Amino acid sequence: LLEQNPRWRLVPRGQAVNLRCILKNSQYPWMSWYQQDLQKQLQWLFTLRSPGDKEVKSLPGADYLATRVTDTELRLQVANMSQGRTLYCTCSAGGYEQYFGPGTRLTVLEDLKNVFPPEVAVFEPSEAEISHTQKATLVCLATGFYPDHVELSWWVNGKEVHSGVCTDPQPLKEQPALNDSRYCLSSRLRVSATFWQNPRNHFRCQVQFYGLSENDEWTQDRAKPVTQIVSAEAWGRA
């Protein structure tokens, strides 16, 4: 129920951006846009019922034009973004309950020059910890990335795991003073020491980074910081 594309987006100063929201069930024809700012405050923008309806609206600091193109498609153009934000498409029947879609996140950069992908390293369980607790904690460190668009996951013998895992909810700034500071994020996977001690067991943390696309220009000598995965691994030892 409700798909929104894209899910994420990079925007340099000056660029506009288009968002789409497809309604997947005709019983909830009333469709709306809400913005959620960086301080997490939600604010309604528009509600458009019929195909052909369009509206414009200005908030601090983003300008919006919205258009209900078809009975199942709603579009939004976002321009003049000073500060970043997230945009939720909602749908509803008789306006009462409102179901929020998955949202589109917009980040804003002065310069494209300061985008970097993450470096990823895995740190192996302490022997002390295995003796003391009969448990083994792997740590994963994704460092040096900008902006903060990463999705970290843990993979054990080729399958993704959620049990035993905890990822920092907030990345921390490497140079907290600077305006455009590169970020860093940690995660932990904790397993039984018997499982760590089997050397047939393979561990990987995977960091999906979200960065530049085919459409974004790139002028510098280092590799174009494109949307990519960066991984790190470790093997069990006895």
């Binding site: 405050q41 895995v122 740190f123 460190l141 049990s163």
Partner: protein, 199 residues
């Protein structure tokens, strides 16, 4: 219309009860839904209340509405850590939702057998680099982010080994410097006295 949400941050121990209190200005308002946002995810509907009714209960959730006083509240009995999230109240008459600024609810887990310890972990290839791991500490312990901008310290974070039914707190620290090792890492944070520091 403005909707005020009184509590901004709310930290509570697993199992105990919590409230969030909201007020609204515009007397036409007759629908009052609640949404939660787990960190880095979307908004999910929790529970709502309409103008006829004063009290509504669903599992461990209760909502109250007083129309005369224009206040309404969400009550969570027996909090679990899964309840950790930002909660938002809203009001609706223009049939849009007006939202409060949100309440961050953290439910800290009850650590059955504390075992505070600070371990050193080596890179799977190689070595140093290394990282310091503070773990197994009690929920009432707070980790502070250090006073030296060349050493990095994570906030506490809870993981759940689903079988064997075990939860644990953890914080990570690392630097590139001379003058940093695990003995000194979480100086600046209270830290129990019986913390194990191996060699």
């Amino acid at each position: 219309e403005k909707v005020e949400q009184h509590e901004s941050t709310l930290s509570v121990r697993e199992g105990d009860s919590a409230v969030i209190n909201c007020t609204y200005t515009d007397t036409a308002s007759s629908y009052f839904p609640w949404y939660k946002q787990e960190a880095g995810k979307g908004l999910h509907f929790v529970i709502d209340i309409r103008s006829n009714v004063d009290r509504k209960q669903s599992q461990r959730l209760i909502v109250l509405l007083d129309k005369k006083a224009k206040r309404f509240s969400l009550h969570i009995t027996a909090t679990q850590p899964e309840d950790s999230a930002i909660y938002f109240c809203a009001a609706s008459p223009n049939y849009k939702l007006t939202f409060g600024k949100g309440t961050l609810l953290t439910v800290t887990p009850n650590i059955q057998n504390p075992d505070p310890a600070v371990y050193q972990l080596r890179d799977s290839k190689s070595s140093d680099k290394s990282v310091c791991l503070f773990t197994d500490f009690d929920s009432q312990t707070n980790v502070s982010q250090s006073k030296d901008s060349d050493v990095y310290i994570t906030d506490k974070c809870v993981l759940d080994m689903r079988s064997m039914d075990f939860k644990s707190n953890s914080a990570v620290a690392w630097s590139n410097k001379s003058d940093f090792a695990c003995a000194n890492a979480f100086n600046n944070s209270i830290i129990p006295e019986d913390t194990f520091f191996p060699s």
